[PDB]
Design a protein around this ligand. Structure first.
Ligand SMILES: N#Cc1cncc(COc2cc(OCc3cccc(-c4ccc5c(c4)OCCO5)c3C(F)F)ccc2CNCCO)c1
Lengths: 115, 117
């Protein structure tokens, strides 16, 4: 059965720091981009939309522009790593990570910032 | 590009009636049930989780037990029709439908419940 896995449900982090929220999905041998969809939202704000290898900066929410990046390096290891840099207080909430890979699941991640 | 469609984004529904909120997705004349996933939530509550031509009931939230039905009849027309029956004020809110069908999208639908005296 297809199932998205989350190592850490809560992220405690600082203002101005860099965090990498992670989501594991089952990669068999070699990653078929033609089946892979990854989508991170937070409160219905589009943070990453990767569909079959294709992403568009224009569809990213204003809040998250130029700061927030899916790490492609990690995807062949079965890991949608969302990396935000220069973290702000307005970033903080329930992030949702949705993977499709011949089968679909999501998981929620809470993020608290300090200072 | 794969695109889930919503005929109406608001529904005004009577108390004690039945509502059928609809999400349209593109079918290229094919059933292909093993690639179709449909999921409705509302306020983090799982309402339907349809997969391999079968509604998975253990993951479904029991506040929606015996009252939420996905209309399977409608799916070959490219239409996840969620039918809730015996509509209450708690059923007002933002429903989210997630379709995966070689291509993935979601849409929100608002439901306002009215009870004339
Ligand atoms: N504000 C807002 C808002 C408004 N409109 C659309 C969107 C989201 O735009 C997109 C989202 C995309 O990928 C989402 C995605 C990716 C991977 C898996 C799933 C998925 C599906 C089923 C599931 C599941 C997960 O987990 C288990 C249950 O069954 C999903 C989702 F369907 F749930 C891909 C493309 C678009 C672009 N939009 C096309 C034009 O309209 C957001």
């Amino acid at each position: 059965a297809f199932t998205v896995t989350v190592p850490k449900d809560l992220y405690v982090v600082e203002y101005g720091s860099n965090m990498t929220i992670e989501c594991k999905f089952p990669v068999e041998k070699q990653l078929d981009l033609a089946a892979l969809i990854v989508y991170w939202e937070m409160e219905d704000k589009n943070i990453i939309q990767f569909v079959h290898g294709e992403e568009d900066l224009k569809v990213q929410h204003s809040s998250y522009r130029q700061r927030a990046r899916l790490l492609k390096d990690q995807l062949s290891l079965g890991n949608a790593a969302l990396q935000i840099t220069d973290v702000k207080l307005q970033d903080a909430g329930v992030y949702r990570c949705m993977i499709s890979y011949g089968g679909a699941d999501y998981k929620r991640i809470t993020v608290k910032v300090n200072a």
